[PDB]
A paper describes a structure:
Utilizing this approach, we obtained a 3D reconstruction of the myosin VI MD in the nucleotide-free (rigor) state bound to F-[name] at an average resolution of 4.6 Å in the [name] filament and bound MD. Local resolution analysis suggests a gradient from slightly better than 4 Å in the [name] region of the map, where large side-chains are definitively resolved, to around 6 Å resolution in the converter and lever arm, where only the contour of the backbone is visible. We therefore adapted the molecular dynamics flexible fitting (MDFF) approach to generate a continuous atomistic model which captures high-resolution features in the best-resolved regions of the map by enabling fitting of large side-chains (blue) while avoiding over-interpretation of lower-resolution areas, where the influence of the map was restricted to backbone conformation (green). The resulting atomistic model (‘HR’, high-resolution) converged well with a molprobity score of 1.44 and a clash score of 0.41. Consistent with this prediction, the large loop 3 of myosin VI likely makes more extensive contacts at this interface than myosin IIC, with MDFF suggesting probable interactions formed between D574 in loop three and K50 in the [name] D loop, and E575 and R95 in [name] SD2. An additional unanticipated contact is made by myosin VI R561, which forms a cation-π interaction with Y91 in [name] in our model, discussed further in the next section.
Myosin motor proteins are responsible for movement and force generation across multiple scales of biology ranging from muscle contraction to cell migration to intracellular transport. In this study, we focus on the MD of myosin VI, an unconventional myosin motor unique in its ability to walk ‘backwards’ towards [name] filament pointed ends. Here we present cryo-EM reconstructions of myosin VI bound to F-[name] in the rigor state at 4.6 Å resolution and the ADP state at 5.5 Å resolution along with corresponding atomistic models. Finally, by comparing the conformation of [name] in the myosin VI-bound ADP and rigor state structures to bare filaments, we find that [name] structural deformations accompany motor conformational changes during the force-generation cycle.
Author numbering:
A (entry chain D), B (entry chain F), C (entry chain E): 5 to 371
């Protein structure tokens, strides 16, 4: 009956039935084993904690993110993520619903095969399909044309779609935002004598990466008044009681995303990968990619975009073109709000890969 | 059969079966041989008197404490303590019950083996285990987080614990309180012209260390009003009828522990060893070590602590952090009431070292 | 006039003019004030002794290293270090030369500014520059490619360099060896019944860390032969006439630098940090990072590396890729013999930060 949209984020895995409100459960993609000797003898502990509870047990575990640079490390950790998601969040049996899974646009073969095969044999679902996360972000703002910028930890993408076809030859995948921003924040906060090295404490870096950062309009000129002894200091409080005063590094960390040359890699800035994906599309269609520029994903929630992005695009594109960048509030749930629209609707009600078809065809059902 | 918790005090050896009230026997850990020439000729007097009988025969013996600086001096005296303890207090044979023994956290190797080994061949016990005295103090107050203190005459320890694991990197052992406080009390009672030198009479010094002593809120401000003519004098009476009036030195002796520069040693104050053991724990756990500071051991019974310790820590700790320091009645028996809770409980009924397994393994069994 | 290279040791300050032999003066940085009351009104006693004289007057002082966890404690003690170093060792006046100072590759900013500024106002030197300690280790063995190690009591570092560019993305800082090895030797020597707790005596432990330790080739098998009566026992003689017999623990203390699991801290050994810095470098260059592995410092002077390090890396590295590990003699003076080659060579004779430029610009001239 009711289909299930379960999003394999690298965040922030999101789980909720098909429509109509919001993700039922969201928690960080963490499994963590206990690194210290037991001496109270309940015994009372698990062999492996998942999140939320692996984020309540900080400082006693060794956190292992099972998805790293756009790929899952091994399915031994992945199945334990899955077991936690179905059972102590959604509560429903896996044999009850057809499921809908998400992937990253341009993900390595044979990691969709191996996934599909393992998931059928481990949880015994009755039907399934895998839709890519960028394409789904079209549905959330309900547009049939435009270039989609879907940016989440740890893979961003630039996919062009026109009424309502996706060009296979103009899709760009960057392995950059947001975990490299997390690692960079840890590298420029060490620069003020605040050292973070332990895995649990690495989460604190994420919590200040969320809340306290912002982006400039013109970097060099916002940087200029930062050099003056004028306040940009906001004072954060740390869990053990420590008080940190950051100012410069606060706008510096997300600004890193414009120009990967700050980490020295040859990769082009979001400025130019957006533009170069548009300029791999056909000449006539370019007219309508402007003003259907749609940003998405959780790593676009800094309170200093899109007007940085705006000022940058308007400078690089042709003269007198209508360029408005549509960025809805609460971009982090865009993908899920996509998935919800698909699986609740017909036509695609008769289009899942069903069990008899899977048994007959085998795991080689890629296209 | 019911288990036996027999606690290897540094005091004050304590003995009583597992559960549920108080130890049956507590008495000074002393052996004393008769030093003066014999003339009564009944005769039959014992070669070595143990406590408490060696404390009702003061002035005719030469007391030799079998435990000094937290380690047992020789097993010739120790076996006579043991034989006396089981037989002439409890009235039971060690063959009947599994035992539970205690140690000092960070006790020199190879003195846990030789102990374990000698006890199997001397008393023919069916099973045993050795738990460290600091860890056991958690059970007494039902804590699942917090820093634990076994402070006895004369080895103290400082162990931080988080639910329900031990931290190898945060544990500190001081060979400071309390026998050096006794020896210091005898050295500063010489300052008022009352000189004591004999071992047996040293016990009287311990008895005034118990009853008369107290700690200040602020040393310097109690010291100021001590210089005034107003009375802090309490009049003690001595075993042969003599009257001593001490006042200034009365609050000075336990105050010595708050910074042992009085002795001359470089060793840090309890104030700071408490704090510095906390700042060797992981950052997110520190939040809950504050306000689960639980004191223990008989040597913490001076009336002025813990509110000296409280006022001192709140000054050294980060701003606006909650620090409730827990120190109720029962602290002299804290460790033992801990041991009682363990040996009655399952799972740990199957976790004693039993004789066949010992026979196979040998005395190399530690870890 | 000839420039002066004075190396701001983590240890262990080294001082000597630009080239070409060895440093004139080496001593382990300690300052010690006199802690007991004077009883000879002679008296002649200085307020602060530096080393050598503060290592001759052990047991009546409280030794304080001015550089702790890779940063100077405060400039009140540091300025007295400096004044002693230039004046009462090297004899030359700072007013007569450009000087050359060393730093860590990654260290709290702006404590390189404050340093540079205070040193200019206190000693009023004609010109200066601050070079990182890791880069200089290339010069010492005349390498044009390779990964550099400054490991001193207590900062290690891992910097990859390619002819003659430094790669920012791959620089890794470990706050691991060697003072935590000093603390670890003190923590496992209490396990054999010899206690060392007071400040002066802590130096003696450090001296036994120098001479008698060694690293195993195969850990598991060295542990096997330790359990038998097969002698690995060496007899040390101790300052007050005492005899120390160490076996197993002799190889246990340095083994800590592999596998930080022994302390429980979340980090990976030199084995893995070497690899993890290489696999953060661009693909083509990796070919010459293998076989230009250059070890350095004083805390790599154990007589059981590098062929352990080699056998371990060779197992983890890609198959049939040749890996030479070059550890020269002289490693304690590596940094200094590096600095010496640079400051004697033009072109960089005209590139010191000079007084007129400093006076106009202020502390920001650092970058
Ligand atoms: N307000 C915010 N500002 C900046 N970054 C944020 C904010 N909220 C969340 N993030 C980042 O966004 C990430 C979540 O992105 P998400 O949309 O879940 O990506 P995915 O769906 O691919 O997992 C988190 O890792 C977090 O670091
Ligand atoms: N009321 C008191 N005030 C101060 N000290 C006391 C008091 N009662 C006992 N003590 C001291 O505490 C010691 C006993 O401590 P205890 O908890 O038995 O240590 P352990 O268990 O390690 O032997 C005795 O040596 C005695 O000097
Ligand atoms: N033969 C040796 N074996 C092991 N360690 C040594 C030896 N000689 C010196 N050390 C250690 O090396 C340290 C000195 O390292 P050094 O190169 O001076 O570091 P830095 O230059 O950063 O101060 C000393 O603290 C000492 O403990
Ligand atoms: Mg995504
Ligand atoms: Mg005790
Ligand atoms: Mg160094």
């Amino acid at each position: 009956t009711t289909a299930l949209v379960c999003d394999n984020g690298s965040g922030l895995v999101k789980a909720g039935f098909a429509g109509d409100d919001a993700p039922r459960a969201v928690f960080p993609s963490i499994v963590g084993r206990p690194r210290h000797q037991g001496v109270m003898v309940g015994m009372g502990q698990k062999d492996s904690y998942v999140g939320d509870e692996a984020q309540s047990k900080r400082g006693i575990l060794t956190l292992k993110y099972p998805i790293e640079h756009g790929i899952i490390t091994n399915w031994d950790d992945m199945e334990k993520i899955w077991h936690h998601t179905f059972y102590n969040e959604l509560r429903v049996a896996p044999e009850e619903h057809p499921t809908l899974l998400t992937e990253a646009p341009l993900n390595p073969k044979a990691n969709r095969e191996k996934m599909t095969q393992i998931m059928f044999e481990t949880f015994n679902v009755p039907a399934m399909y895998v839709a890519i996360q960028a394409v789904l972000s079209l549905y959330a703002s309900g547009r049939t044309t435009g270039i989609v910028l879907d940016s989440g930890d740890g893979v961003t993408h630039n996919v062009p779609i026109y009424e309502g076809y996706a060009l296979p030859h103009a899709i760009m995948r960057l392995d950059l935002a947001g975990r490299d921003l997390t690692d960079y924040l840890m590298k420029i906060l060490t620069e003020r004598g605040y050292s973070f090295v332990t895995t649990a404490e690495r989460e604190i870096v994420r919590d200040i990466k969320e809340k306290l950062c912002y982006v400039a309009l013109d970097f060099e000129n916002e940087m200029a008044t930062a050099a003056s002894s004028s306040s940009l200091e906001k004072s954060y409080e740390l869990p053990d009681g420590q008080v940190i005063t950051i100012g410069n590094e606060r706008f510096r960390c997300p600004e890193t995303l414009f120009q990967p040359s700050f980490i020295g890699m040859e990769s082009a800035g979001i400025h130019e990968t957006t533009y170069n994906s548009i300029m791999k599309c056909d000449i006539d269609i370019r007219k309508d990619l402007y003003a259907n520029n749609v940003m998405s994903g959780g790593t676009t929630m800094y309170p200093g975009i899109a007007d940085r992005m705006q000022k940058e695009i308007t400078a690089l594109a042709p003269s007198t073109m209508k360029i408005k960048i549509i960025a809805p509030p609460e971009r982090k749930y865009s993908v899920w709000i996509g998935g919800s629209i698909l699986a609740s609707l017909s036509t695609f009600q008769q289009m899942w890969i069903t069990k008899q078809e899977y048994d007959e065809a085998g795991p080689s059902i890629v296209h």
